[PDB]
Amino acid sequence: YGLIWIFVPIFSLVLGIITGVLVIVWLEREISAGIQQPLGILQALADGTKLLFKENLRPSRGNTPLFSIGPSIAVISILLSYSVIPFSNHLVLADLNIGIFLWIAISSIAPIGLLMSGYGSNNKYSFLGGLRAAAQSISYEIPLTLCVLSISLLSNSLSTVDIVEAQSKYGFWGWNLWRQPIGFIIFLISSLAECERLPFGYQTEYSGIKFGLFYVASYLNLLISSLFVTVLYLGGWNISIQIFGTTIGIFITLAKTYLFLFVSIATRWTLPRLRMDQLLNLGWKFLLPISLGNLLLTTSFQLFS
Amino acid sequence: FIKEKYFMPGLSPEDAAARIKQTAEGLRDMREMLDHMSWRYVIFYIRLKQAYLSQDLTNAMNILPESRRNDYVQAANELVENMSELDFYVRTPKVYESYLYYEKTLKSIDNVVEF
Amino acid sequence: MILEHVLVLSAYLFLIGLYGLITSRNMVRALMCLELILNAVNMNFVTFSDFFDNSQLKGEIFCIFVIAIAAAEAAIGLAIVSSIYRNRK
Amino acid sequence: FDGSFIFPECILIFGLILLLMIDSTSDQKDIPWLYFISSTSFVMSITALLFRWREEPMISFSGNFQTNNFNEIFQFLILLCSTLCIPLSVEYIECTEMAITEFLLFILTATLGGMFLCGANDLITIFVAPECFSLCSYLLSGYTKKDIRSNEATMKYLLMGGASSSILVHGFSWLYGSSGGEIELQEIVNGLINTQMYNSPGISIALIFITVGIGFKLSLAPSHQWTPDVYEDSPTPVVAFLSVTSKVAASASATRIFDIPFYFSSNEWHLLLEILAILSMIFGNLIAITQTSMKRMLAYSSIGQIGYVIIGIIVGDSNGGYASMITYMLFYIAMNLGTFACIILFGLRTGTDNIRDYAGLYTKDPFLALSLALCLLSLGGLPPLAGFFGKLHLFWCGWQAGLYFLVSIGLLTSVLSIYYYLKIIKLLMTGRNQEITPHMRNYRISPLRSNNSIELSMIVCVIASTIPGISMNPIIAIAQDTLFSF
Amino acid sequence: PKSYSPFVDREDGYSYYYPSDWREFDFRAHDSAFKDRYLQLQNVRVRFIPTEKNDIHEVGPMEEVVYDLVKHKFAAPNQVATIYDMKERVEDGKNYYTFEYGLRTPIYATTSFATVAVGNNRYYTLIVGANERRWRKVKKQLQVVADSLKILQ
Amino acid sequence: NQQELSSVVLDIGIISVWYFLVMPPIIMNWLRVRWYRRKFFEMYLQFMFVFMFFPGLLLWAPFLNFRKFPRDPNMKN
Amino acid sequence: LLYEYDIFWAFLLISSAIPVLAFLISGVLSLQFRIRYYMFALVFVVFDVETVFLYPWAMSFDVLGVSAFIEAFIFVLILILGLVYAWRKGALEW
Amino acid sequence: GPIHDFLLVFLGSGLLVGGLGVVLLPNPIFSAFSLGFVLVCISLLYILSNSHFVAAAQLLIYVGAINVLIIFAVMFMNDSENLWTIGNGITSLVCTTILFLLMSTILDTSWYGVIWTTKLNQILEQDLISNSQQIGIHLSTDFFLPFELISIILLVALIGAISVARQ
Amino acid sequence: ATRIDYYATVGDPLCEYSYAKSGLGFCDLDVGFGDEAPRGVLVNIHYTARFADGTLFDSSYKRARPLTMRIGVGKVIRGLDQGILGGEGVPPMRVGGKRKLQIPPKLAYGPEPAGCFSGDCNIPGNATLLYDINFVEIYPGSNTR
């Protein structure tokens, strides 16, 4: 009893995020089968086992510990921050007094995995690609944590269950869609743009299980960004305008993350690459000053509250 | 400096008899810390004094006759399980079970000092 | 309760980063060693605030400040190293 | 809540905001008026600090910052150093084509960090403000940007300064642990004997690591190897400003964190300062003989004069106060910024810093030769100049406290300082038509900007190296009234 | 009970009210504690001491039990305890003490309108407080919440 | 120290086998019979539904029986 | 007290032992000089420390009045003046 | 319990071998990634030290902001070069004797006996319990002066990093 | 017990302790004349610190400087804060005052050996200390923070 009741939320959460990344794979396949025109559900597990059962493919470079732990840290930098999501008023993994702050730290250790990937690969291709991916993970972190800060400033709390409860006071208008739609646009562009999805490799020596690690790390990055879209702006389990409340609230937040998956994949297919110059022109000279701007706006607005 | 006490040799049974009375008198007055809910000093003191008791009981039993061995080891392992459940209800902090097992370890330390 | 061992680890960092700060070929290894020294002092402040000072988190507030100044020192030291890298050919 | 006691630093942050507003609007059309608003920000900060003269020694912020008369005096000395050193880089920036903007920012924020280190009372600010000042120091040292030696030297300085502050703050951590969880200097000695840790190895390691970190800040002869290597390639105005301001703020801290939280271990405290002082007085003045550079041997002379200051640190308030240390820091600023003003003018007219280029300055420029010779004789102290009476007040207080082996070594090394000073004065007085250098013969005083403020501040430093030794009684009369240092 | 939610606890015996949809969370030693989703100090919480007493009147007088309850068992040393007036009710057959204090740290302006009870070898110490910057608006509302603790068997 | 439920068995396991058995064939059937008869609003809400309702479809993924007869043919194999 | 992150250590242990175990079951069973992005990260590090300062203030702004408001207002004024400095100079340039 | 302090000793061994990887490896890249491993272990030690906002702050700021720029400057390999950088007979001597003084200082000090003292200023004032709120009330207005000073420090750090790193 | 740090003083005028509710041995020798000591401010006292039997282990006259203490915020023993400020209505001290105090080990550091540098201890368990406080002055600029 001393470890079973403690392990089973971790086990159920790992199984839930494996089912969620299965959803994201087959749901991008479904939107590509809608915009591009059963067995297909297990085709994603067939993809996972094709990427799983393969060759190690190690070249003659002598960075074997970094070659091992590169995609491993790239996975850890998303997987360690799934202890953070209040799917309902219960069934969150930890109490987590600093809710989203740990997510910002674990999403900020992702360029460590990107540079370890850029050095684990003995190729100038993946070297330049790891430089670009680490630099865009660095570059898009600041308006990300700015709108994180602005929502946590509206709530006056960092713990995610407190802000999820705090969004349900005025009602349907009490959500952060009607409190910060500007910061919602900030969180939209930071969520889509950081994971090398809305703009755009660097896996030219990683293959076998390591390529599958980068695969699942990217799509779990999409999963956790979507679940923070749910627990920040759309609401956690409240539809205001025992045991069953948890079961309906997990359905509410999964409908909200399916909403953001459809919006994100559609916006991916209807926008091209920013060509790497408008990318930084956005994230430094435009996105960061307007994130500071609506930070000042929400700072002036919480005086009366 | 318990890290050097690992490097130092073990205590005397009479030294254990002194430290068990000291441990009793120190468990008397953690009531200042329970009602203020200073659970970090409480887990410090419980883990330290359990680390003292684990080397103290087996050392202090060696001056007692065989009439005292049975009931002494009975009350001693009663104290061990009470202190371990107190450890469990301070590392899962609730005030009620903590003060309840605190009174349990007081009414189990009151006769180990009696030996 | 061995929890005073983290101070021994702190002194271990404070000696090894100082040894690496004395014998260092380039500058950035010695800068990383300086950062390990700031870590040693930093975890010392965090340990002492954990032990003694929990109403005020003065050691933890100073932890935030010393990691801020560690960041500023590392940023300007790497700025100097990068300006050397620009100014060599 | 109202911290009105930190209004001279409020004038500094106001000047910083005006600096950034000018640094955002036009960026090219304001060289001299920016210097005007910065120098008048200094003058307004000085007159605010004089308007707040007779105020109580009130700890203004929430147990964080003490505006003592002692701290007011040391803030006044940092403001005086910044005022008398701020015209010494109005020609260096236009000569080396750097940015006068953000250089004024660096000087203002180094002055800010020094003035907060003077009044710092929590152990937090005795790390924030010195290393505020030290990050400003690294930005001021890495500022020429034309070579490899200056940048390598300031990178080694950044390594040694980070090591310096980190040893100092490891000692501060042993304070914070051995003295319970207490900070605030007044409360730390309470925290040692609340926890019964006065007779502890932990507080001994605290004192040793703190005094090693301060000796790194004071460049005393164990921890002194940075100043000559880092004052070659780093530019002469920031050599002046950083050496003088660093050592006055480090003596501020070296009184501050050594009398109030360390009056119980004062025996080993005096012994450690006596060891570092005697080695510093010997070795600074004994290296500075044998160097063909000018700023390196000036750095060692600064080491020797700070070793003279440590005699005033070791004596208490009673048997010859810290007032002698105060007036010698005033004399030290006054007769050292004049020396560096002359060294700057040899380099705004020649370009070199080699000491053997000085042969023939009396024939070419008797004014600059007279100013430099008189500043060096003030630093050595043969006639009644300022530095002789400063060393006299120091050795008086040390002899009255009974520190015989401090005063005698200070006198022998004062003679040893007299040697390399008159070694310099051989060159800038004589000249024999081939001992003159081709870097000297083409002196060209007339290709110059205008009636500069370098010459004005230089002659103010020359008069302040001559007459306050004569007029010392008002300075001692205004320095003896600093009895609240405790 | 104008707009109040009677959260009972039939196992532990306590039951009291809440103004308007205050949330749910685990407190460190209180059970429900139900903070108000916007403020950080406005919450009402109650805890337990397994005593062997029966009345709050026999353990000590009210004016003297509030003294060693606030000055010695509530107030941290860095804050001062401005104990205001104390009041007593009788619900069915048991005394029901209710008092007021303000913990004044040099930061952190706050206060608490705490009440105390006993029964069933437990000991109820229902604490409600809010900020000191806004307390005269939130005085009578938290008062009429706080006096509504019932002890039922 | 609450234990507000005190139910030993047949509280969430019943709801789990209900959601894992009754739901997924009707969900997959609604995915089949409404594959073309849909607005993009309807495809939007069906995509949200199949995203919410994923891990119950594990016992219905390899099995496929009533799927292919777009005529009135005879089993001439 | 090891209750807030008591499940998080086991979460870390499972998540840290799973990639090496995946590597074992996959092994048994079958010179540029660009410093522009460097300059972006060099602006990033100090803006990130300033966000770290902005984190517990906005955590604890509710208990404080307009005083902490003007505290962090001066702080973000320093931040946006550094940002305007980054605009007007050759800082980003991309 | 024993899992806590055994995790402490495990973090200690891994962090000391990572620090010796920072100091004594031929690759500076290997040293920088061992630094990243060390700082992850530092954040885990601060989780063990019941200082969780501190833990994730050090994890956010000091590999996410520091070690990224560290590995940037390390892969862009530049050039090579009485407490001073003169070794093989000095730093070993002072390293061993300062190590021996610190080992005789930490191990020979009843730390828990000092934890028994000064216990009144850690009784955890009852109206708040949350760590980040307590950091914010002790940081914003209590130590207001260094909070206002690091704004100026990081301002000057950014401005000087621009004015140096471009040239 | 040992490590008493021998500082031979002249002793202080003995008196009877008018006890408190919290068991404090309390004897106000010399009534000060001035303001009362404020709660939470830095104050400067002199004292000679004694054990049960009266042997000295600490003194402010050993350090030849008044010990600066922020009293009332719990940075010291509660015996100090209850014998200088007064907890149960005990009258607070005025400036230039002298007072003997018998600190009970309930108020003092329990049976816990307060201070143990190397094997030996500074204070033994249940020492029931004797403080002889010479409350001389308030710190000149001092705040309640």
Swiss-Prot record, chain A:
Keywords: Chloroplast, Membrane, NAD, NADP, Plastid, Plastoquinone, Quinone, Thylakoid, Translocase, Transmembrane, Transmembrane helix. NCBIfam families: PRK06076.1-2. The keyword Thylakoid applies. NDH is composed of at least 16 different subunits, 5 of which are encoded in the nucleus. The keyword NADP applies. It comes from the Eukaryota. Pfam families: NADHdh. It is found in: Plastid, Chloroplast thylakoid membrane. Signal peptide: none annotated. It is a multi-pass membrane protein. It catalyses: a plastoquinone + NADH + (n+1) H(+)(in) = a plastoquinol + NAD(+) + n H(+)(out); a plastoquinone + NADPH + (n+1) H(+)(in) = a plastoquinol + NADP(+) + n H(+)(out). It comes from Arabidopsis thaliana. Belongs to the complex I subunit 1 family. InterPro entries: NADH_UbQ_OxRdtase_su1/FPO (IPR001694), NADH_UbQ_OxRdtase_su1_CS (IPR018086). NDH shuttles electrons from NAD(P)H:plastoquinone, via FMN and iron-sulfur (Fe-S) centers, to quinones in the photosynthetic chain and possibly in a chloroplast respiratory chain. The immediate electron acceptor for the enzyme in this species is believed to be plastoquinone. Couples the redox reaction to proton translocation, and thus conserves the redox energy in a proton gradient. GO terms for molecular function: oxidoreductase activity, acting on NAD(P)H; oxidoreductase activity, acting on NAD(P)H, quinone or similar compound as acceptor; quinone binding. This is NAD(P)H-quinone oxidoreductase subunit 1, chloroplastic. Its main location: plastid.
Swiss-Prot record, chain C:
Its main location: plastid. GO terms for biological process: ATP synthesis coupled electron transport; photosynthesis, light reaction; ubiquinone biosynthetic process. It catalyses: a plastoquinone + NADH + (n+1) H(+)(in) = a plastoquinol + NAD(+) + n H(+)(out); a plastoquinone + NADPH + (n+1) H(+)(in) = a plastoquinol + NADP(+) + n H(+)(out). One of its GO terms (cellular component) is chloroplast thylakoid membrane. It is a multi-pass membrane protein. NDH is composed of at least 16 different subunits, 5 of which are encoded in the nucleus. NDH shuttles electrons from NAD(P)H:plastoquinone, via FMN and iron-sulfur (Fe-S) centers, to quinones in the photosynthetic chain and possibly in a chloroplast respiratory chain. The immediate electron acceptor for the enzyme in this species is believed to be plastoquinone. Couples the redox reaction to proton translocation, and thus conserves the redox energy in a proton gradient. This is NAD(P)H-quinone oxidoreductase subunit 4L, chloroplastic. It comes from Arabidopsis thaliana (Mouse-ear cress).
UniProtKB/Swiss-Prot annotation, chain H:
It catalyses: a plastoquinone + NADH + (n+1) H(+)(in) = a plastoquinol + NAD(+) + n H(+)(out); a plastoquinone + NADPH + (n+1) H(+)(in) = a plastoquinol + NADP(+) + n H(+)(out). GO terms for molecular function: NADH dehydrogenase (ubiquinone) activity; quinone binding. The gene is ndhG. PANTHER family: NAD(P)H-QUINONE OXIDOREDUCTASE SUBUNIT 6, CHLOROPLASTIC (PTHR48479:SF1). It is found in: Plastid, Chloroplast thylakoid membrane. This is NAD(P)H-quinone oxidoreductase subunit 6, chloroplastic. Keywords: Chloroplast, Membrane, NAD, NADP, Plastid, Plastoquinone, Quinone, Thylakoid, Translocase, Transmembrane, Transmembrane helix, Transport. One of its GO terms (cellular component) is chloroplast thylakoid membrane. Its EC number is 7.1.1.-. Coiled coil: none annotated.
Swiss-Prot record, chain I:
GO terms for molecular function: peptidyl-prolyl cis-trans isomerase activity. Residues 40-139 form the PPIase FKBP-type domain. Keywords: Chloroplast, Disulfide bond, Isomerase, Plastid, Rotamase, Thylakoid, Transit peptide, Transport. It is an enzyme of class 5 (isomerase). It catalyses: [protein]-peptidylproline (omega=180) = [protein]-peptidylproline (omega=0). Its EC number is 5.2.1.8. Disruption phenotype: RNAi mutant displays impaired NDH activity. Its main location: plastid. Disulfide bonds join 15-27, 116-121. It is found in: Plastid, Chloroplast thylakoid lumen. One of its GO terms (cellular component) is chloroplast thylakoid membrane. NDH shuttles electrons from NAD(P)H:plastoquinone, via FMN and iron-sulfur (Fe-S) centers, to quinones in the photosynthetic chain and possibly in a chloroplast respiratory chain. The immediate electron acceptor for the enzyme in this species is believed to be plastoquinone. Couples the redox reaction to proton translocation, and thus conserves the redox energy in a proton gradient. PPIases accelerate the folding of proteins. It catalyzes the cis-trans isomerization of proline imidic peptide bonds in oligopeptides. Seems to be essential for stabilizing the NDH subcomplex A. Part of the chloroplast NDH complex, composed of a mixture of chloroplast and nucleus encoded subunits. Component of the NDH lumenal subcomplex, at least composed of PnsL1, PnsL2, PnsL3, PnsL4 and PnsL5. Belongs to the FKBP-type PPIase family. The gene is PNSL4. The chain holds residues 73 to 217 of 217 of the full protein.
